[PDB]
Amino acid sequence: VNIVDYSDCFEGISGGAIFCNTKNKEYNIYNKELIETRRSPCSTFKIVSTLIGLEKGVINSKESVMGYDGTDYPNKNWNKNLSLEEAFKESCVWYYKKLINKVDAKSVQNILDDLKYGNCDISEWEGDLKNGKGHLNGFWLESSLQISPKEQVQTMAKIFEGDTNFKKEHINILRDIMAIDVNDANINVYGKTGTGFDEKNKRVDAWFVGMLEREGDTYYFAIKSDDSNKEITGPKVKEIAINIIKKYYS
Ligand SMILES: *C(=O)N1C[C@H](NOS(=O)(=O)O)CC[C@H]1C(N)=O
């Protein structure tokens, strides 16, 4: 366990980072207090909800659809019968809400318990209805479910090292749709962003969670901001993460 200083990559934004290589148990931690603090996963939960949907047969492949009903949305790309791969990349809320509402709560509870997914608290299934967004809400979006960045990395590692009961076929689908292009062919990066605002504490929850493969070694990582500036989003934290990866993990 090495405590490290990634502050220059954060360019003044409050946050922390954790990178873990489970082969040689090398844990690299920037801002330990934050890395151990549980927060809503927001859209990073789509990593797990994709696997839940595949395991339960709600979806079956990166092509699978959820029966778009014509509802109007401001994001152009939500207004179509999009595939799993597209819904993941566009973070399409209606697709993932419809997916998860086909699964019984006991099944979700037991999968989260098996994964040790933070507090595993799905008590507020409907989500944070006081924000007015109605059915665009759920337990994983600034609501009952909370997970720390360290726990995110532990979950990512358990999934992608083959240590869960999820089918290998399904984990490979998730790998495919999480892959990102960082304009460096010598590292394979995979991940997912998330963005929320913590009304109680007046701070963002901005995430980039995933893994890095670099010639033999694999690092599971979570980058998290808790800045008070509402301009700090998941995509901004992904930029910070990529800067860290290129500086220290190339
Ligand atoms: C998930 O965090 N969300 C869904 C969507 N994607 O956000 S992301 O670009 O950070 O991945 C919009 C924000 C958020 C939400 N409001 O539900």
Side-chain angles (χ1 to χ4, degrees), residues 42-44 46 78 90-91 93 133 136 141 192-196 234-235:
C42 303
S43 288
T44 67
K46 279 181 235 289
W78 295 14
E90 292 298 326
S91 237
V93 171
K133 294 177 61 157
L136 288 174
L141 174 62
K192 176 76 189 79
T193 55
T195 308

Side-chain angles (χ1 to χ4, degrees), residues 59 62-71 73 75-88 90 92 94-95 98:
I59 50 173
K62 78 207 217 323
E63 315 302 341
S64 289
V65 294
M66 284 306 296
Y68 176 56
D69 72 355
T71 301
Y73 298 101
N75 184 331
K76 274 182 37 223
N77 293 308
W78 295 14
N79 294 269
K80 61 199 207 193
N81 198 34
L82 71 181
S83 61
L84 173 64
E85 176 184 359
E86 194 152 356
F88 190 87
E90 292 298 326
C92 174
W94 74 254
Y95 183 110
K98 189 174 183 180

Side-chain angles (χ1 to χ4, degrees), residues 47-62:
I47 294 162
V48 169
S49 65
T50 300
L51 292 175
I52 291 170
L54 292 167
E55 166 65 17
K56 304 300 289 192
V58 179
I59 50 173
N60 282 309
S61 85
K62 78 207 217 323

